[PDB]
Amino acid sequence: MESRLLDILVCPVCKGRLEFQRAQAELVCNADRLAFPVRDGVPIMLEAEARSLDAEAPAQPSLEHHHHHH
Known part of the structure; x- marks a missing residue:
């Protein structure tokens, strides 16, 4: 038998x-x-x-007035 299919990845x-x-x-x-x-x-x-779809990823990179440059 010859298989075709576009089914590569299932859960x-x-x-x-x-x-x-x-x-x-x-x-x-x-x-x-x-x-x-x-x-x-x-x-x-x-x-x-x-x-x-029920739980999204919360991503907020450090909301802070951080000293930089030196």
Whole structure:
């Protein structure tokens, strides 16, 4: 038998096919509401270090009047 398929990556937990978006470059787990981020070529298939549609990543780099130059 000859196999064709465009099915390369399924969710390692739910076994649901990943949904490749180009917003933040994410593979959305279309059942768990998760999204594995593709960090320019390298996809992070780690759920804890990925992003969710329920839980976004809060990133605000030090809101402070910090002394610089010297």
